[model samples]
Target: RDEQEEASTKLMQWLRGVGDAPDENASVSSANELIFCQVDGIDYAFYNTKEKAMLGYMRFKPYQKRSMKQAKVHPLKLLVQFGEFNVETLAVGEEKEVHSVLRVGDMIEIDRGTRYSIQNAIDKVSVLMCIRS
Candidate 1:
């Protein structure tokens, strides 16, 4: 348990470094966890620039990875429809599954039967996810 706590602390620090905040609900629920940033919407510009975080009017137009990588045994994810970040659907991998459009508030059942990599529906999207057995 001590190791789990230590890992969680380190994971948050590492995630912030990459470019975003871990979601509140996404933060607490973990048996064993990993982090990743998911970028939605039309702008790939922020990710390309590698900015630490967005500010000002960009707050609504905020560009940062969210807690899309939070996974555990077929985890279900909700789509955040915060304009400029309209991701129709998220990706399950970089393969053919990439570019597939997902719906808002879509109940995506991530298959943990085998390990799979999930990519965001937009550019600069990624995750550091794990499937605990």
Candidate 2:
């Protein structure tokens, strides 16, 4: 139990350290719980960017598919930076999924199994996110 949490913590730390407060750069390793999109079911997750986060926006992918997994299951909390962040989607009736603007500062958290969109800029939009299992 605790062992998995420790692993996930280490995994999240690596992303923040190795990556950009690396926008677009993310994590994955067999059981690593990252984010996913699904409109069919309901993408589950959470978000909490610092009080002084970054300056940019994200769109909750309309009709994006958010769903399943069964590995050792290590949830990760990462120091994620976004470029013009955006998510993926595929459905006929999905709304255009407007953008949610934010200013960079520290980090943010967006749980795994949620509807998300990740667009990119060339330089700066800082934050962090997490996925707990």
Candidate 3:
């Protein structure tokens, strides 16, 4: 028990040292703890490792058969819905078109300069669009 306790104490010391040195190489490994802590109604970082904290916005838009006359500059897009939806993709400088039907949990990943539009299938749809920064 003494040996184990010593080993755990050394491990915690190393962890605390890593937290102190932010310029050092660190990463978020698979763990069983909360990454952030709330203090005085504000969020505080509790971990030493740095991970890809994707920042984005999620919004629900009513179904509309509108066209995106041009492609978007953003590279990442995630479309989510609980109902059926029809999507149309338009290519640049041409009349190239592609269509598909999306359902619940379905997602669409798009690249930069890719134009697209959405329309309802049967009934009105509530689309959840997640735009990544």
Best candidate, lDDT: 3
Better of 1 and 3 by TM-score: 3
Global local distance difference test of model 3: 0.47
Per-model TM-score versus the true fold: 0.24, 0.24, 0.45
| C-alpha lDDT score of every prediction, in listed order | 0.33, 0.33, 0.47
- Candidate 1: list runs displaced more than 4 Å: 1-61, 66-70, 84-95, 101-107, 113-133
**Tens digits of per-residue lDDT for model 1, 46-123:** 221122221101121233433334344334333322222332233445333322344333333444332233334444
Candidate 3: misplaced stretches above 4 Å? 1-63, 93-95
Model 3, residue 96: C-alpha shift (Å)? 2.2
Model 3 TM-score on a 0 to 1 scale: 0.45
Backbone collisions counted per model? 2, 34, 0
